[PDB]
Amino acid sequence: MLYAQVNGINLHYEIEGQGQPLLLIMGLGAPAAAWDPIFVQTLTKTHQVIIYDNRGTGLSDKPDMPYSIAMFASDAVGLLDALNIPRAHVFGVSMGGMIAQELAIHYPQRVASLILGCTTPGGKHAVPAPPESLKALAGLTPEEAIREGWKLSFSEEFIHTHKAELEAHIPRLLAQLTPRFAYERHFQATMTLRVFKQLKEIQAPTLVATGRDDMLIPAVNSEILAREIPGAELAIFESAGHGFVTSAREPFLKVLKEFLARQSV
Numbered sequence: 512m513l514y515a516q517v518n519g520i521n522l523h524y525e526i527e528g529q530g531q532p533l534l535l536i537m538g539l540g541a542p543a544a545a546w547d548p549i550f551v552q553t554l555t556k557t558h559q560v561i562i563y564d565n566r567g568t569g570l571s572d573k574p575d576m577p578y579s580i581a582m583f584a585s586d587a588v589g590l591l592d593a594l595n596i597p598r599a600h601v602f603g604v605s606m607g608g609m610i611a612q613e614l615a616i617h618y619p620q621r622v623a624s625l626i627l628g629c630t631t632p633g634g635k636h637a638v639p640a641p642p643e644s645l646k647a648l649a650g651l652t653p654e655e656a657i658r659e660g661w662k663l664s665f666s667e668e669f670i671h672t673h674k675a676e677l678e679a680h681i682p683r684l685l686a687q688l689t690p691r692f693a694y695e696r697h698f699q700a701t702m703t704l705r706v707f708k709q710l711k712e713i714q715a716p717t718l719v720a721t722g723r724d725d726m727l728i729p730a731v732n733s734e735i736l737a738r739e740i741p742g743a744e745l746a747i748f749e750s751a752g753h754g755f756v757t758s759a760r761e762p763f764l765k766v767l768k769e770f771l772a773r774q775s776v
């Protein structure tokens with residue numbers, strides 16, 4: 512129901528809670544509805560949490576044009592401008608983490624602190640998973656694509672013991688599908704990231720976090736990020752993968768809240 516007009520397009524967002532602003536940036540082809548709800552609701556107790564649909568996703572406009580990480584970052588800053596927020600804590604997951612890096616480099620004045628979740632600096636120094644594995648875009652229903660996607664983010668035992676919790680998220684994901692053309696624009700956007708050499712210039716206090724057994728974005732990329740960014744802290748969660756925000760939710764909340772309690776806008 513709420514929209515901000517940014518760079519000539521409409522971006523759907525939701526904002527909740529009181530406290531310092533915390534902007535959450537979601538990954539490849541994923542709308543705000545993809546956020547773990549307990550994670551987001553818990554953060555609203557201490558922070559004013561902003562979530563949103565990147566262009567191409569959810570209820571935002573979906574222009575069929577080349578997308579880039581710079582463009583996504585410009586959209587995020589424009590959202591903050593529309594909300595009249597001069598400075599925000601930024602947490603980005605996966606491609607959202609790439610957007611966050613771009614924000615910290617090119618718009619440092621807008622970024623109070625930086626949290627980089629299961630992400631990568633891209634380029635020849637990064638380690639990707641096979642492009643093949645990013646086929647959670649098949650011949651499958653959207654529902655069965657989501658269930659197959661869980662195998663990339665969660666262990667078999669986690670999927671078994673948390674079945675009801677995972678399945679309850681399906682309707683929220685199916686409510687606004689990312690169309691194939693937009694998904695491809697997001698995928699190509701991931702190859703426009705040119706930040707490795709500039710990571711050392713990031714001034715924001717930084718936390719880098721991932722699951723050790725991430726099969727989609729190898730966890731070594733977090734070690735690379737943490738090494739390059741001055742003063743960056745590193746949190747690797749042991750029995751967890753790409754879906755660590757869900758499968759390591761309480762340990763990550765504890766680390767994230769402790770990090771944020773030492774920060775300000």
Ligand SMILES: CCCC(=O)OC(CO)CO
Nearest residue numbers: 526527528529530559560
């Ligand atoms: C500072 C803006 C407060 C605001 O209007 O949003 C509220 C109500 O949704 C939650 O933060």
